[PDB]
């Protein structure tokens, strides 16, 4: 029912940039608050950004300030990640995930797509 | 003893830029939440931007995503507001604010500064 599908991972060379998206389907995108999250290799889940249902507040993990931008289509339910300046620390698994708006709690998750910074 | 003064307002042609400045003093101010408040000329007040105390994330009034951009400098003590693409629309009297954190709510004040959009 519920549908997220990432793409735009894959490999940079350290400065370069890229841009992640994460289509949804199944559900009133415009609703809920959606989140990226990454894993570094043999490391645990960790926040990256999140962005309200609107549109119109967002967080920003203090490791990507001034590099990293997310932002939403509520019209063709995406959720995107704008990634500049990017450097070998930000080699991950990349998740969106969606949140409930009771708890904001996330109740479900894209398939992850893999993002190596290598010269 | 807490203080803020806020400075940067005034005249701008329609489409032009300007930067509000909200110099803070007396408090410890990465702990508090900030937030830019306006008065259009015989308005009710109307929350304009808001940004956390480690500046991670940040609030728009929908009426100006896109186009201003609040951020603030934990050294300086200072609290800013970029405001880009103005229009008539946008004159008023802006006031920056403070948040208690036990509540969010506003517990002190700017001065206030009038932007006037017109040719």
Redesign the interface.
Same mark, same amino acid.
């Given at each position: 029912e519920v549908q997220l599908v990432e793409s735009g991972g894959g490999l940079v060379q350290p400065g370069g940039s890229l841009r992640l998206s994460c289509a949804a389907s199944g559900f009133t995108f415009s609703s809920y608050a959606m989140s990226w999250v990454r894993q570094a290799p043999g490391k645990g889940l960790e926040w990256v950004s999140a962005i309200s249902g +609107? /549109? /119109? +507040?967002? $967080? $920003?993990?203090?490791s990507v300030?001034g590099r990293f931008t997310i932002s939403r289509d509520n019209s063709k339910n995406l959720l995107y990640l704008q990634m500049n300046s990017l450097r070998a620390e930000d080699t991950a698994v990349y998740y969106c995930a969606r949140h409930a708006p009771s708890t904001e709690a996330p109740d479900y998750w894209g398939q992850g797509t893999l993002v190596t910074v290598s010269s």
């Open positions: +609107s /549109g /119109g +507040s967002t $967080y $920003y993990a203090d300030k």
